[PDB]
Sequence to fold (259 residues):
Amino acid sequence: ADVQQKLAELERQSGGRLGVALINTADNSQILYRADERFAMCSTSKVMAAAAVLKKSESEPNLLNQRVEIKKSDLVNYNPIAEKHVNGTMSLAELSAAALQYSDNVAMNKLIAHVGGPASVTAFARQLGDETFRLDRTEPTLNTAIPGDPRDTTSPRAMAQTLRNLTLGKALGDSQRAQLVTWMKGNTTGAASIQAGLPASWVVGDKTGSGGYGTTNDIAVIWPKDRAPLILVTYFTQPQPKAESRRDVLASAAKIVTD
Ligand SMILES: *C(=O)N1C[C@H](NOS(=O)(=O)O)CC[C@H]1C(=O)NO[C@H]1CCNC1
Fold:
């Protein structure tokens, strides 16, 4: 309708490929634009890795307090928290926090390693119901986002359904569900993304992503002031190889689906 047209104008203006999936928990409504098309998650995948460790802590009490050694060799392209902890230790709750709130790649690599590799992260998604999610590489290789490459991708619909189950559903235990929500609420990297296109009185819990071919992503659990929660997934990719980041598109996409 009006929302499908408005998003198509935005996709045309941006000169790329936009994937939008919104779920309104009040009446179970959906706004779906390229919801089945495969997009490279890049850093939005970190949620699944955090949740896999969270699901693991249900059968492993005191798991999130277990210390993990941070060495100089572990350091990759972007590690804001891990670089401050070199030749020291970080707990699994701290690595989860660093990965979700500060987008630390070394922290994400430790989460992947702890569940048994990237295939075990994909194995956890099948356990929730997600048959689209796939993690084939570790950081930093998982953010290449080459057009046509199916490695490290998911569809906006599948990620929206999965985020709904993890943050609001029964995929994780009450204690674990509360922790993921708290971490995502404490995100620092999503100010100019989805949150930028929503009013200041709305409480947002999000994860952001940035990859090759101008890939700019954001997945969010939104609490509209005084109303039932929303799940929004805004995925965006560009044709040029070193195309600059366009977080404004995600803001406009969020604005179009809510306004
Ligand atoms: C995730 O996509 N990351 C990790 C960091 N994310 O922080 S962010 O949420 O603000 O975007 C930074 C961007 C991206 C990343 O690290 N990409 O590095 C890859 C891509 C090119 N080769 C390594």
